[PDB]
């Protein structure tokens, strides 16, 4: 909603990008290709998650393959549509009202399931409940965790986590909720795949990373 927030975040994102660029060399790149700043560290890159919208040029979306029969060439971003752009953060973030509604619905379903399974002469199924996986503001994904009995003893950890700023000398951005206590509310798994495939695929990304300079086809399993 806040246009000013978007403007400031894009401005400081460009600030950090320029800091990386000047760290690379004193001058300023004329083009500054974005493959370096968005390739995940698994593939050997900075992997900067960004909320902006930068369209990757098609000129850098091509790649080659020196097969024995011949030197083949491919272009992942050859679709006749808008130029490939790195997806922004909000594209895979659940709306807060949606989060609350889903939490209410999933908790009602879990309560109904527990009531039904009480008469089953056994604990909850914990398998059919997978239809409600990774949902709810409380850690419903961690509702079947082993440490729950250990976690049930703690009461009101929110105030302790808040005062950790006066306890810990380092800033804690995740003071809204504690990890492994309220669960990983934000599911960021598809973001990595979307970013790597929208950059031109694994081969397209590696085409500019000296990977072809090693004779071994270590596409997978390399350390």
């Amino acid at each position: 909603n806040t246009q000013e927030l978007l403007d400031l975040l894009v401005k400081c994102e460009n600030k950090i990008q320029t800091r990386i660029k000047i760290g690379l060399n004193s001058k300023m790149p004329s083009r500054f290709p974005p493959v370096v700043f968005y390739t995940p560290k698994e593939l050997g890159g900075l992997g900067m998650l960004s909320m902006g919208h930068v369209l990757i040029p098609q000129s850098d979306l091509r790649w080659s393959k020196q097969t024995d029969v011949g030197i083949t060439h491919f272009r992942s971003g050859m679709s006749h549509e808008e130029d490939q752009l790195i997806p922004n953060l909000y594209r895979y973030i659940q709306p807060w009202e949606s989060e609350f509604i889903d939490s209410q619905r999933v908790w009602a379903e879990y309560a109904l399931k527990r009531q039904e399974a009480i008469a089953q002469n056994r604990r909850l199924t914990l398998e059919d409940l997978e239809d409600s996986w990774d949902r709810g503001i409380p850690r419903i994904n961690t509702l079947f965790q082993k440490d729950r009995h250990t976690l049930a003893y703690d009461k009101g950890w929110r105030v302790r986590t808040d005062f950790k700023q006066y306890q810990v000398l380092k800033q804690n951005p995740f003071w809204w909720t504690h990890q492994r206590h309220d669960g990983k509310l934000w599911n960021l798994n598809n973001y990595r795949t979307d970013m790597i495939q929208a950059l031109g695929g694994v081969e397209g990304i590696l085409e500019h990373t000296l990977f072809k300079g090693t004779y071994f086809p270590t596409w997978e399993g390399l350390f």
Partner: protein, 278 residues
């Protein structure tokens, strides 16, 4: 070396001069030219090769922008039919285009960038520029220029061909680039410098074939971990069982060696007080 850099980048500059330390460009050029000479000499029968030599190349002419000095010269016996210049991907050939008694082969050591990695286009442009130039001096007007993109590790060639040597030259280039000594050393240097360790191999955890081939193994031994950690336990109706350690020997054996190993150690040394299995 022959790596062109735009804008001074101290990190890239230092990394490149580490990778290409000790005249590595001249070394790989000499390796490739020697491999080509040996390959040509080995198959000199079908190629009607009378002399296969190299000129007195200036030491700096390995990384030079223009190949003023030819790399390999090959003189046949009487005549040699050469077709029009083309790329290795082509198939058609009309050897009646020219008839010369000499032939030249040039190796272009190039470092491809993210946009200048087109070996075939680079090969075509470089052949056209070098062959048609006043500064470049080629003893023979008919020949082929080869190019190796080190960063791309891609081999290519362009120009005329000896009758029936085009598949031979393609196969020779592929085989040499597969296991060239200096190229392998450069690849190992790159792997070390970038800290990209080669994918770990899978040990033959299977032993059914190993059991039959146990005598084939030069040296082999096996040791029982539980034997070293084995602790004799007493028996009592009311008293606590005394699970005292027995000994430190691991009951090691080596049938291929014709003997066995007895790493006998003290029971207390084998297992101390309140010592876990780990």
């Amino acid at each position: 070396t022959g790596i062109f850099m735009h804008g001074k980048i101290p990190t890239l500059k230092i990394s490149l001069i580490q990778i290409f330390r000790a005249h590595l460009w001249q070394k790989i050029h000499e390796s490739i030219v020697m491999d080509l000479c040996q390959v040509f000499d080995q198959e000199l029968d079908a190629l009607e090769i009378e002399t296969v030599q190299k000129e007195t190349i200036h030491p700096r002419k390995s990384y030079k922008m223009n190949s003023s000095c030819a790399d390999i010269l090959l003189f046949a016996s009487y005549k040699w039919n050469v077709s029009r210049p083309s790329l290795l991907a082509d198939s058609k050939d009309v050897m009646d285009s020219t008839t010369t008694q000499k032939y030249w082969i040039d190796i272009q050591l190039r470092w491809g960038d993210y946009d200048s990695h087109d070996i075939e286009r680079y090969a075509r442009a470089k052949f056209l520029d070098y062959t048609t130039d006043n500064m470049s001096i080629y003893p023979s007007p008919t020949g082929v220029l080869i190019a190796i993109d080190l960063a791309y590790n891609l081999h290519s060639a362009y120009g005329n061909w000896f009758p029936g040597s085009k598949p031979l030259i393609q196969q020779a280039m592929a085989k040499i680039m597969k296991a060239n000594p200096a190229l392998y050393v450069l690849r190992e240097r790159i792997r070390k410098g970038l800290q990209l360790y080669s994918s770990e191999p899978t040990e033959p955890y299977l032993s059914s074939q190993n059991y039959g081939e146990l005598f084939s193994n030069q040296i082999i031994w096996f040791v029982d971990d539980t034997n070293v950690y084995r602790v004799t336990i007493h028996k009592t109706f009311e008293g606590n069982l005394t699970t005292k350690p027995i000994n430190g020997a691991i009951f090691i054996f080596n049938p291929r060696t014709g003997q066995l190993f007895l790493k006998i150690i003290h029971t207390s040394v084998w297992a101390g007080q309140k010592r876990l299995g780990q």
